[PDB]
């Protein structure tokens, strides 16, 4: 008798073996990276498959969007990931029409995480196996960068990653990072990690996508830029793969 058949059971060792068996699911997923720096936040991606007769060109997979301010990166299951963002895109607007202003990023994840806890105990139901990254900007705290975990606990990081072989990629980030980077120090950094801890030697433009947040709006709020292929195949050759 071992304690895994249901997620409503502590172990005698004091642990919930089903939840660990969800936090391991993301290891099957694809890499995701974010960096926080001076001018604005950046993100990366890596599609799990990069075959021929399916277009990942116009069809974004790892980089959805939640508002003109906030954008995320996603991992894990796909059917249990859309409904989260299709809840987040609601909760924000249901914070706007009542309070007539934008969302603080901390409240969203605080409200998006504590439902995953809801799918951890009350009922014999699956916990949503997903490890989002949150990227956005609020005034009471400036730039921001959070991270989730299908348990329901978050963390405000500076620059981290998830997915396949992040444990090594962190080591390629822990020691070769500088807070005073503007943007492109993080870029050649970011794209250098994925180049190191991949599965195959392609690194084709289809295999990965980027994104950005920027406060370049001159006293306007913020801009985004989710790069088409023509903006990222030109930069890696402009960076020296």
């Amino acid at each position: 008798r071992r304690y895994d058949s249901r997620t409503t059971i502590f172990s005698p060792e004091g642990r919930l073996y089903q939840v660990e068996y969800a936090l391991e699911s993301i290891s099957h997923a694809g890499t995701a990276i974010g960096i926080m720096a001076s001018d604005g936040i950046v993100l990366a991606a890596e599609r799990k498959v990069t075959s021929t007769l399916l277009e990942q060109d116009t069809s974004t997979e790892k980089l959805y969007k939640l508002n003109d301010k906030i954008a995320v990166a996603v991992a894990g299951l796909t059917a249990d990931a859309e409904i989260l963002i299709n809840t987040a895109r609601i909760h924000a607007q249901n914070y706007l029409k009542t309070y007539n202003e934008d969302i603080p990023v901390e409240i969203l994840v605080r409200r998006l995480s504590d439902i995953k806890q809801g799918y951890t105990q009350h009922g014999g139901l699956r916990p949503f196996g997903v490890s989002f990254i949150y990227a956005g900007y609020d005034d009471r705290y400036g730039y921001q960068l959070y991270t989730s975990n299908p348990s329901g606990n978050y963390t405000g990081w500076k620059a981290i990653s998830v997915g396949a072989n992040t444990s090594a990629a962190q080591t390629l980030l822990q020691m070769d990072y500088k807070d005073d980077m503007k943007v492109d120090d993080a870029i050649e950094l970011a794209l250098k990690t994925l180049s190191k801890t991949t599965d195959s030697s392609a690194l084709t433009y289809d295999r990965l996508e980027f994104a950005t947040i920027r406060k370049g709006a001159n006293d306007g709020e913020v801009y985004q830029k989710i790069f088409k292929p023509q903006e990222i195949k030109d930069i890696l050759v402009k960076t020296g793969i």
């Binding site: 089903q18 969800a22 069809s59 059917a79 139901l125």
Partner: protein, 249 residues
Amino acid sequence: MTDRYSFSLTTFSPSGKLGQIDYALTAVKQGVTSLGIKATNGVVIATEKKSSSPLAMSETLSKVSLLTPDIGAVYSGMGPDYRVLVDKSRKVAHTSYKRIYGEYPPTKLLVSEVAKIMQEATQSGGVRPFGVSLLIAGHDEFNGFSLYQVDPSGSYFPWKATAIGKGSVAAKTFLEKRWNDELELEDAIHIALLTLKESVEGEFNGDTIELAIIGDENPDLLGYTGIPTDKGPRFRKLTSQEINDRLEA
């Protein structure tokens, strides 16, 4: 040689995968072949049929079905988990998008709805998924043509040219060797047949298959003429006599 975790679908193994959705797909293979190709002006879909008793009027059943005048579909897998799926689908095209946006959906906001019909199966235990995997073809004024796929796990891809069922790996190998990124329509039909030649048994005529296409307007189908912009469909399936002659080449 699997045990203790395919029993249900709400217990992640230590390896970190769900139980029997992986095994639903095992039937999807064991169903008949299928395919669909994206041209620069149209999209095609095709399946055979190994009608068990020849006495059956094979015309009655239809692998292909309607969703809109502009969108059509086909499976490769279990049958009776299709003919209900479509009514559960086109019912959503009306109540979801149409009656609160006036006109018919694009393809992806009609495919995303299909998924939410699917994932509601894999939510609890002792309630199985659908033993099928679909592909959808349509057109719009925003981005035009598209060819998507749908799996029982809720996921939905796009594609450019594909096959599924038995002749899946063999066909998709041939398509990579008999495809171009800037071809035309009619040669696509000249492919799908000889692609469908790959894993065929019995006959090959126009009676023992059913394939459809989409393309330019076909206002002869309309019947409600007298209006400038009340334009007709972009969907029609080809008659056996319209196919049995094309086969002659």
